[PDB]
Amino acid sequence: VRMSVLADCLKTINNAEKRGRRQVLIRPSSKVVIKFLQYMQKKGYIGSFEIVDDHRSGKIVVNLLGRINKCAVISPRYDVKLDEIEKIITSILPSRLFGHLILTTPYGIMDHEEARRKHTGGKVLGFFF
Amino acid sequence: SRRTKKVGLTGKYGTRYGSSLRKQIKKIELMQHAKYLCTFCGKTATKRTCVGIWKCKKCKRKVCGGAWSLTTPAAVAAKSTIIRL
Amino acid sequence: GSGKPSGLRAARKLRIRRRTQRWADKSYKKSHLGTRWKSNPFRGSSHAKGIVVEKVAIEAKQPNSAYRKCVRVQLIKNGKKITAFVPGDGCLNFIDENDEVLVSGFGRSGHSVGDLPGVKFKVVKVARVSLLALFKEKKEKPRS
Amino acid sequence: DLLNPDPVEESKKHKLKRLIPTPNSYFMDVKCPGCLQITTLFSHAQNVVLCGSCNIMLCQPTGGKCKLTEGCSFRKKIE
Amino acid sequence: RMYGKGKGISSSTLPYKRKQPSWLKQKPSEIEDAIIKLAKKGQTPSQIGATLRDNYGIPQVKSVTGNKILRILRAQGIATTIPEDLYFLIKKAVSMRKHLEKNKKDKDCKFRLILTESKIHRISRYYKRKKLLPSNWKYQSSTASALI
Amino acid sequence: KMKRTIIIRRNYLHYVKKYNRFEKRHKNIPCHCSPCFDVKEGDIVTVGQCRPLSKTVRFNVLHVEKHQIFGSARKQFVLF
RNA sequence: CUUUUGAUGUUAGGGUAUUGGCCUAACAUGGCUAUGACGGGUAACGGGGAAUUAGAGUUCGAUUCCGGAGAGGGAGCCUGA
RNA sequence: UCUGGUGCCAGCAGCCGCGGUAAUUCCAGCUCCAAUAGCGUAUAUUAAAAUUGUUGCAGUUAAAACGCUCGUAGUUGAAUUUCAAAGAAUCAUUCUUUUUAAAAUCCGAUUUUGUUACUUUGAGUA
RNA sequence: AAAAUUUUUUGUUCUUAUUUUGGCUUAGUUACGAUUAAUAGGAGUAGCUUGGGGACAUUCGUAUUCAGAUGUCAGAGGUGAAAUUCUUAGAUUUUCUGGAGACGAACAACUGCGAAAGCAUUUGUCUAAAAUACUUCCAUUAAUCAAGAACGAAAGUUAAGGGAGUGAAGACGAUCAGAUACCGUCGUAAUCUUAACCAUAAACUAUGCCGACUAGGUGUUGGAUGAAAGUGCUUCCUUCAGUACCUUAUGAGAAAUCAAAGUCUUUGGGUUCU
Ligand SMILES: [Mg+2]
Ligand SMILES: [Mg+2]
Ligand SMILES: [Mg+2]
Ligand SMILES: [Mg+2]
Ligand SMILES: [Mg+2]
Ligand SMILES: [Mg+2]
Ligand SMILES: [Mg+2]
Ligand SMILES: [Mg+2]
Ligand SMILES: [Mg+2]
Ligand SMILES: [Mg+2]
Ligand SMILES: [Mg+2]
Ligand SMILES: [Mg+2]
Ligand SMILES: [Mg+2]
Ligand SMILES: [Mg+2]
Ligand SMILES: [Mg+2]
Ligand SMILES: [Mg+2]
Ligand SMILES: [Mg+2]
Ligand SMILES: [Zn+2]
Secondary structure (H helix, E strand, O other): OOOOOHHHHHHHHHHHHHHOOOEEEEOOOOHHHHHHHHHHHHOOOOOOEEEEOOOOOOEEEEEOOOOOOOEEEOOOOOEEOHHHHHHHHHHHOOOOOOOEEEEEEOOEEEEHHHHHHOOOOEEEEEEEO | OOOOOOOHHHHHHOOOOOHHHHHHHHHHHHHHOOOEOOOOOOOOOEEEOOOOEEEEOOOOOEEEOOOOOOOOHHHHHHHHHHHHO | OOOOOOOOOOHHHHHHHHHHHHHHOHHHHHHOOHHHHOOOOOOOOOEEEEEEEEEEEEEOOOOOOOEEEEEEEEEOOOOOEEEEEOOOOOHHHHOOOOOEEEEEOOOOOOOOOOOOOOOOOEEEEEOOEEHHHHHOOOOOOOOO | OOOOOOHHHHOOOOOOOOOOOOOOOOEEEEEOOOOOOOEEEEOOOOOOOEOOOOOOEOEEOOOOOOEEOOOOEEEEOOO | OOOOOOOOOOOOOOOOOOOOOOOOOOOHHHHHHHHHHHHHOOOOHHHHHHHHHHHOOOOOHHHHOOOOHHHHHHHOOOOOOOOHHHHHHHHHHHHHHHHHHHOOOOOHHHHHHHHHHHHHHHHHHHHHHOOOOOOOOOOOOOOHHHOO | OOOOEEEEEEEEEEEEOOOOEEEEEEEEEEEEOOOOOOOOOOOEEEEEEOOOOOOOOOEEEEEEEOOOOOOOHHHOOOOO
C-alpha cells in the first residue's frame, strides 16, 4: 500500500540520478508531484517533462541534467511557524548559500526564502540540494 | 447467574467419593440424559427409558440401543459394512 | 520504517515506550529505587561519626601481597557496624580501643577500591583532630 | 526513447506493463460452411455459442482463446 | 492476497476508447430489456454481463447505455436484499459447516471456516455503514442455512 | 437514562512538545435537557452555561442535530 | 469501583449572605473506567524561577514576590463589618 | 633514567599498575611543574552519553524478531472537481495591476457565496 | 387554509369588505440530477488446470514373528578377542500352509503442496487452495495490529484397546586400576488406535509483515501467446506466478559475507514486538 506518492517519485528520481540515466519514468502522478517538479524546473535542476494520459492516474517522463545531489521528503508534514525556519534550515541544508527547503503554504508551494519574503508559514514537504 | 464453576451436574454429590470419580460420573451422565434425533419422524425427542431402551416422545417408537447413548460405534461400523455390500 | 511509529498522532506510544525502557538502565534504576534509603549505612549522607570497636588487618588481592590496616566502627546514628581503612604509613597507632572518628566515602561510592576486598569507607579524623595534620606530625598532637 | 517506444517491443510485452494498457482480445465475424448466416463472436469466449438458424456448435471453451469449429472461416471486425 | 501468500496479477483491462464501437447496432432499450428478461430467470449481475458478452454482441454495457448493470436492475425494483458476493460467501460458509458437522477431525476445514467468517464480518460491516443492509443485520451462524 | 438529564462526550487533541506530536483525549459533561427536545445516543448538541442545578450539572441544551452512528457512542471520534 | 449508612438524577421543603445532596422526606436506577477508574509510594506545599547544555533535552525550586495551610494533637465557641 | 634508606615488608595507587639490591611510582633531601590568597577530599547532580536516541541507537553471528495465523481498540491509507491568460513597476529576476462561469442584490452598476485543523496579525498580562 | 393598513356601526363596542402571505391534487419547462475503473481489494466465469493440502472408507506388498507340517544331522549366535544365550526332548539351515501387528525401500531430485507444526501403496466420496485466461460484477470495501481466539513435533499424564520389532528402568556377561559407561545377551514402561489433557524444541533462513526502485547469465515447476520438425503431439520464441545457483558491484558491513544484510551524518514510505 502506497501511503504516499511523492516519496516514491522522489526516491525513483534520486536512484536514477545516481547512475546517470538521462531519463526516468514515474508511474503514479498527481497535482502535488507536478507542482514539485515545476519548482525544481524553475531552479534549473531538471529539464522538461511530459505527462502521459492513460484513462487512469497518469505517468510522467522527465529529462535529467546530471545535476541533482539529493531529493527526498519529510514524511510527517510538521507544521512550521515563520520564526522557526532558521533551525530547520540549519539542521537540513548543506550550506547557507545553496539548497532549498520546500513548504506548503496558504499561498501555494514555495521554498524558504520566498516564504520569508511573503511573511508566511506552513508545513514541510521536502527538499533538494 | 452461573451457580457453579466446575462440577456442574455432579453438585448433587456434595464432597463425597473423590474428584476423579465425580468427573467420570459427569462424563457418563451428560450422555445419559440428553435428547436424540428420531430418524422416523424428524423431531429431536428420543430419551432413554431403561438401560437399553430408547423411545420417541412424539411418534412413540422404541429403539434398542446402547447403555448410555443411543448408538455405540461398534454397531455403526458393522451396519456400514453390511450396507456397503 | 525503522521499528518506531512516525505519525502525527502517535505521541502516546512513544512516551510510554520511553517510560518503560528507562528501568533497564543501571544508573537510572539505582538512583530511583526506594530501597537505597534502607541498604546504606550513611542513609544518604557524605560523612558519619562512630566509636572504634576493633583493629584488624586485611589481605590484599591475589597478585599483590600486603596486610592492610583497618578498624571496625559502630555508628552513633543508627548503631550499624562498618569497616574503614586507615591511610598512612604508621597512622594505626594513633587510634585506641574506643575513640570517636569521622569516616567518609572511599571514592567509588558504592564500590570497593583497588586492592582491599570489601571496604568502602575511610577514616578522616580521630579524637576530633585531623588525621592528616597528625601524620604530618608537625602540626598537632592528640587531645590526651 | 522512453516517450516513443519501438512498436514491435511494445506489442511484445505484458498488457499491464506497456505504456498504454491495451487488451489482446478482439471481436470477429464467423462463417460456418453451408449455413448461410453471419454471427458475431468474441475471442476468449467462455460459453458455447449456437447458430441462429441451426443448433450447430460454433466454438468451444478452453483456458485461453476459444476453439473454433473445423472448416469455419473468421474475419476480424473493423473499428 | 488478503489471507494467503499469493501475488498473482491476472485481470481484464479496458480499451482506451470509451465510446461504443462503430459496428454495434442494438438500441439501449433492447439491451435493458435483455437485462431485465435475463435476470427474471434467476441470474446474478456478473453472469448477466458474461452472457451479454458471449451470446450477444455487447463488449461493454456502460458504453451503450449510460448506466451499469446493478443500477438498471435497481431502477425496476429487481435487486436482491443481500448483495451478490456476500451471498456467495454465506453459501460457502454453510457448506463448510455442514461438512464439518459430519467430520470432527478436519482441522484444515475449521481453519478455513474461521477465515471465511472473518471475511463475512468485514464485508458486512462495510455494507452496514452504507445503507445497503439494515442496521440490525447480524449473521447468526446457526440460522444462516435457511437464508435464501 | 436519567430524567431530563444527559451525558455528553467531548473529544480533542493534546500536543506534546518533546516529540512534536499529538494525542487523543476526552472528557464527560452532564447537562440538563428540557422536554422540548427529542434526543438519543449519537446526536450532536449545543449547550450553554448556567448556575449550578445539582452536584454536577452546570449546562443545558439549546439545539439538537440528528446524527446517525454505526458503532457504540463511546467509540466515535468527532472533533468540531 | 460507588450505592442498606447520599452513590447519580427528579419533586417539595429546611438551612445559609446567596446557588448547590449542603441537609430532610417520597420516587427512579443511575454515575466513573485500559485515552488507566478505584488503590499504593513520594526523603511532594504550587507558581514567578535556578543549574547545565550548538539545537533537542535532563535535573532542581524548604528559602526575597504571589497563592494555600498551621500555631503540642483533635473538636467546640464569644465578640465583632 | 638526581642522591640516601627499605627490600612482596612498610606502604602507594580513581584505572593500567609499583615494591626480591638499579624502585623514574614507598619513606626523605634537592630540583622542577600546575593553579595561586587560595588549593585538596567525600556525597549528589549536568555535559561528556547518538551508553535511552522525536531530531538521533541497535535486533544473521556481539544483548535482542513472539512457534504460527486470525482479530478489537490504536496508528496509517490511490487518482479526480477553476487550470489559466494579457498589460504595468527592477539591475531574464523580484513586485503589482486587468478580467474570464453563476445566482441574490443601487435608473448597461458597487457586494455576498459551507465547517474545522493549520498558518498570519492583534487585544489582555506584576 | 391564519392575521391587514384603508372606511364602516356603538359611551360601553357592534354590521360587513379589494386589501400584505406558507402548502396541497394535477397538467407544463429545464443542458433537469450518479468522477475514474489503481500492474489496491473482494466476488464471478473457463480449461480431460496443477499439487506426496485435509477427512472418512477401501485395496496391495515383501520383510519380521508365532503356530503347523517338511528333510537332514552337530553345532548355532555374537565379538577386536570372548562370555552370558539356544541345541540329539533336533537348534541354526531349505520348502509349503495359516494368523498377527507395525512399516510403505528402489523410483526420490540443491523437485511439489501447506499459516506453522507437517505431508509419499491403490481406488471412491466429501472438502478446500492457489496460479493462468477474461472488453464479467461491486466500487475504497484496505496495511499492521495491545487485549482476546484457533492450531501447535517428540517426550510426559488419564481411560479402553492393541502388543510383532525397537527398547529410558532393571538383571547379567565383558573391558578397565575402578566402569553404576561406551560393546554384547535378555528385558518393563513407552512407541500404534480411539476419546481427553499438556503448550514446550537449535519450534532455525538463529533474518517480523505490506509497498517502490536498482544487474547480467544458467536452470527448473505450473499456465497462456506466436511460430518449425510431426507418422490437433513434441521442440523453439515471448510473457505471468513459484523456486534455486553463478559472476559482479564509484553498493553495504568490524569482518565472515549479503541481490538484501543495498537505495543511511546526503540520517524521516506505513506498522507490531524485543
Ligand atoms: Mg492482515
Ligand atoms: Mg432519603
Ligand atoms: Mg516553593
Ligand atoms: Mg508567604
Ligand atoms: Mg514546639
Ligand atoms: Mg548524564
Ligand atoms: Mg543523552
Ligand atoms: Mg549530544
Ligand atoms: Mg548501543
Ligand atoms: Mg519466525
Ligand atoms: Mg481495477
Ligand atoms: Mg496376535
Ligand atoms: Mg513385545
Ligand atoms: Mg533385543
Ligand atoms: Mg521458546
Ligand atoms: Mg528465535
Ligand atoms: Mg545519523
Ligand atoms: Zn419419532
